[PDB]
């Protein structure tokens, strides 16, 4: 009965990231899509993928997304957001987060 989405508060473009998605109390399997759209306009699909979540895996998942900064048209002059989304059987979740252009060290 409880579906959770935890992602990093701030997501690094052109750098892999991992987000936590859980089902609390629901021993019946599932197959969900992970979607990320530019905020606020939802103009383009930045990242899409699909994962199965079964009882074996504790009923949770660690999908790895990866926004390409090649798809962020903004400059570093103001804080541009992107929005996370999960959808499937008896579930949907939606979370807006901030984006870092960080490359490296």
Q: DSSP for 33-87, please give it.
A: EEEEEETTT--SEEEEEEEEE-TTTTTEE--EE---GGG----TTS--EEEEEEE
Closest CA to 98 of 90, 89, 76: 76
Report yes or no: 65 and 47 within 8 Å, Cβ to Cβ. Answer: yes
Give the Cα separation of 56 and 50 in Å (integer).
18
Q: Is the dihedral of CA 66, 67, 70, 76 positive or negative?
A: negative
Which experimental approach was used here? X-ray
Resolution of the structure in the document, Å: 4.3
Do residues 95 and 83 touch, judged by C-beta distance below 8 A? Answer: yes
**Interatomic CA distance for residues 85 and 88, integer angstroms:** 10
Residue 72 has which token pair?
Answer: 């962020």
Whole-number CA gyration radius for the chain: 14
Q: In what order do the strands lie in the sheet with 81-88?
A: 10-12, 91-100, 81-88, 30-38, 45-53
- Between CA 48 and CA 30 the distance in angstroms is 17
Question: Structure tokens of 25?
Answer: 């109390």
């Amino acid at each position: 009965a409880l579906y959770t989405l935890i992602t990093p508060a701030v997501l690094r473009t052109d750098t892999e990231e991992q987000i936590l998605v859980e089902a609390h109390g629901d021993s019946t399997p599932k197959q969900l899509d992970i979607f990320v759209h530019d905020f606020p306009r939802k103009q383009k699909t930045l990242f899409q993928t699909r994962v199965d979540m079964n009882p074996a895996g504790g009923m949770l998942v660690t999908p790895t997304i990866e926004i390409p900064a090649k798809e962020v048209s903004t400059d570093s002059r103001q804080n541009q957001y992107v929005v996370v989304q999960v959808t499937g059987p008896q579930v949907r979740l939606e979370k807006v987060v901030l984006l870092s252009y960080q490359s490296s060290f």
